[PDB]
Amino acid sequence: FEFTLMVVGESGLGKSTLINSLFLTDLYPERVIPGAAEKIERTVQIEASTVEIEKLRLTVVDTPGYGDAINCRDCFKTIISYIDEQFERYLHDESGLNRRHIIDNRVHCCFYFISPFGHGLKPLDVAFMKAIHNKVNIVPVIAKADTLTLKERERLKKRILDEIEEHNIKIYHLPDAESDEDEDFKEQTRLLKASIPFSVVGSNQLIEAKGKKVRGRLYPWGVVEVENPEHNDFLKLRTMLITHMQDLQEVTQDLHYENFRSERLKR
Amino acid sequence: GFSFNILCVGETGIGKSTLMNTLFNTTFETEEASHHEACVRLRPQTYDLQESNVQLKLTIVDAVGFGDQINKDESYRPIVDYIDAQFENYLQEELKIRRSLFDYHDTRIHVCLYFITPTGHSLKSLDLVTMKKLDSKVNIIPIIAKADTISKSELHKFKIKIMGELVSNGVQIYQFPTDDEAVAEINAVMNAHLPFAVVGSTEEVKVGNKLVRARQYPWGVVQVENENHCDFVKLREMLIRVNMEDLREQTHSRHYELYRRCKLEEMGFQ
Numbered sequence: 001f002e003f004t005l006m007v008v009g010e011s012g013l014g015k016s017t018l019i020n021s022l023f024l025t026d027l028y029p030e031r032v033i034p035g036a037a038e039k040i041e042r043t044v045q046i047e048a049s050t051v052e053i054e055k056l057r058l059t060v061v062d063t064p065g066y067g068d069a070i071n072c073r074d075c076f077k078t079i080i081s082y083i084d085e086q087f088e089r090y091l092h093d094e095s096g097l098n099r100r101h102i103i104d105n106r107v108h109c110c111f112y113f114i115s116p117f118g119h120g121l122k123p124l125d126v127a128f129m130k131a132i133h134n135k136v137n138i139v140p141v142i143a144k145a146d147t148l149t150l151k152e153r154e155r156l157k158k159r160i161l162d163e164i165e166e167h168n169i170k171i172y173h174l175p176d177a178e179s180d181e182d183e184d185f186k187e188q189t190r191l192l193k194a195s196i197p198f199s200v201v202g203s204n205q206l207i208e209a210k211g212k213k214v215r216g217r218l219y220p221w222g223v224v225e226v227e228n229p230e231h232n233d234f235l236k237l238r239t240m241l242i243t244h245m246q247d248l249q250e251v252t253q254d255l256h257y258e259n260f261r262s263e264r265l266k267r
Numbered sequence: 268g269f270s271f272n273i274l275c276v277g278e279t280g281i282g283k284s285t286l287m288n289t290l291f292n293t294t295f296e297t298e299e300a301s302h303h304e305a306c307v308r309l310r311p312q313t314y315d316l317q318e319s320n321v322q323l324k325l326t327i328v329d330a331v332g333f334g335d336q337i338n339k340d341e342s343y344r345p346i347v348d349y350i351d352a353q354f355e356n357y358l359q360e361e362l363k364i365r366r367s368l369f370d371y372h373d374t375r376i377h378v379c380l381y382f383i384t385p386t387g388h389s390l391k392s393l394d395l396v397t398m399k400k401l402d403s404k405v406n407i408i409p410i411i412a413k414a415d416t417i418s419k420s421e422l423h424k425f426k427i428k429i430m431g432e433l434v435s436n437g438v439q440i441y442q443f444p445t446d447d448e449a450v451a452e453i454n455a456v457m458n459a460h461l462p463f464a465v466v467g468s469t470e471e472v473k474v475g476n477k478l479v480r481a482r483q484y485p486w487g488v489v490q491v492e493n494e495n496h497c498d499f500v501k502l503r504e505m506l507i508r509v510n511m512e513d514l515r516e517q518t519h520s521r522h523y524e525l526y527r528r529c530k531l532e533e534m535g536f537q
């Protein structure tokens with residue numbers, strides 16, 4: 001099964017570090033890091049990488065340059081035209097007479113990383129999310145969760161949800177566990193939805209914690225553990241993605257692609 | 268007994284009001300800004316207090332809404348307009364026939380604290396553009412905000428990339444004085460520690476057997492006045508009477524004189 005995940009967010013939020021933390025990949029060996037003088041008028045670029053994880057083929061669609069430019073002069077075009085190009089390619093393939101094994105390149109999920117350093121959503125965040133929330137499944141993510149205390153974390157989560165309601169942003173909603181699964185799957189589902197949006201911490205480094213060498217971030221005053229749910233929501237994000245991959249695919253096909261198909265097939 | 272005018276330039280919610288309250292060990296009443304301001308607004312607030320045995324008329328100037336707009340081309344203009352306005356009113360005082368320079372309230376910006384967001388890469392596009400517009404008008408002190416975000420290894424390399432970028436782009440930042448031999452070595456390490464990695468907090472956490480201003484995390488306690496944790500104590504040394512006087516003198520003898528030459532020749536003087 002194919003799965004394409006798009007990553008969008010201000011540069012320097014730990015995006016690459018979190019993504020590699022999810023599946024222990026090295027998706028960014030050669031990485032163009034421009035100077036400040038260079039990113040004054042930096043265009044948004046699409047960089048896609050495909051890796052096999054256990055088993056499925058995972059594609060990460062990164063968007064370097066997003067937010068770097070001083071001005072935004074259609075800074076969403078390259079991203080939107082990419083999303084539409086994958087829709088357009090699927091429609092052309094499934095419409096062919098000798099369609100055979102169809103390679104699904106449609107974007108199934110878009111992680112939008114939100115800065116923890118502000119009070120909430122910036123106008124660029126709202127404009128972009130409203131620009132693609134009818135095209136892809138938006139998963140808002142609070143990057144660098146270790147910059148927030150627990151009370152600051154609760155406030156930022158509640159406010160982001162309220163501003164999403166305020167601007168009528170359509171984000172991916174986890175399916176309610178149909179009254180058939182175990183009590184375990186029922187509790188996990190309402191727990192994941194109660195922690196949205198996920199505030200996460202990524203790390204490519206080993207630290208000592210509770211007498212074990214685990215991934216995390218080291219400070220003079222303490223250690224942040226990646227896999228500690230009492231520190232950040234990394235496990236809740238990773239579990240959410242794995243257990244809901246198929247549903248993200250299904251909503252992509254049934255909602256966004258069909259809406260694209262109609263919105264195009266007429267004229 | 269003199270005035271001191273601090274300009275705070277940073278992104279919305281970066282910790283500007285907190286760091287001000289932490290520097291002066293008080294709380295100035297300010298309101299949390301939103302991210303949906305159409306333009307950058309310059310908002311000054313004057314306070315009468317004593318810091319380091321000085322009758323201080325402190326004005327804290329905040330560039331409200333900085334970094335929030337989708338399009339930020341001319342974001343520096345309201346900041347330069349304010350700085351130039353204070354140079355202008357001062358020059359009008361000098362050009363008066365019947366003057367009153369000793370009673371005049373000096374409203375010129377003496378320090379600009381430029382909060383740099385702790386991304387961990389180099390400088391943002393808005394930081395480079397704005398500092399290049401401000402470096403010949405104010406004494407810029409670059410600081411890395413919310414430095415309790417950056418581990419010590421990342422912070423070391425982060426400072427180098429920031430300073431390296433100011434050098435290669437030619438951004439003149441303030442330098443603590445090295446002339447007087449008594450404060451030569453100490454100011455040498457103050458300049459060497461730029462940009463200051465600061466942490467602001469007015470909440471008091473009990474550490475050991477003392478209430479210390481700090482930030483409480485599930486994994487630890489970041490002590491504001493711990494110099495192993497951050498550079499707050501080093502930054503606060505700008506508020507000693509010696510450094511305040513030097514920041515005012517550079518303002519007058521360098522930045523204001525450059526403005527003065529431009530205005531007077533514009534006015535027609537030779």
Ligand SMILES: Nc1nc2c(ncn2[C@@H]2O[C@H](COP(=O)(O)OP(=O)(O)OP(=O)(O)O)[C@@H](O)[C@H]2O)c(=O)[nH]1
Pocket residue numbers: 147148152277278279280281282283284285286298299300301332412413414415416465466467468482
């Ligand atoms: N991690 C971390 N958080 C901080 C630090 N200083 C302040 N904060 C938090 O950041 C939030 C922003 O605080 P403010 O100082 O009011 O924000 P601001 O920079 O004044 O920006 P405006 O609201 O537009 O005036 C506060 O809720 C603080 O709890 C810091 O040093 N480190």
Ligand SMILES: Nc1nc2c(ncn2[C@@H]2O[C@H](COP(=O)(O)OP(=O)(O)O)[C@@H](O)[C@H]2O)c(=O)[nH]1
Pocket residue numbers: 010011012013014015016017018143144145146147200201202203217386387388416417421
């Ligand atoms: N405080 C904090 N810093 C992080 C975290 N994850 C990554 N970083 C640091 O942020 C810096 C830039 O991270 P990077 O993953 O390259 O950001 P990206 O540009 O969004 O891909 C690096 O120095 C990381 O070590 C986190 O969860 N918390």
Ligand SMILES: [Mg+2]
Pocket residue numbers: 283284285297298299300
């Ligand atoms: Mg404030």
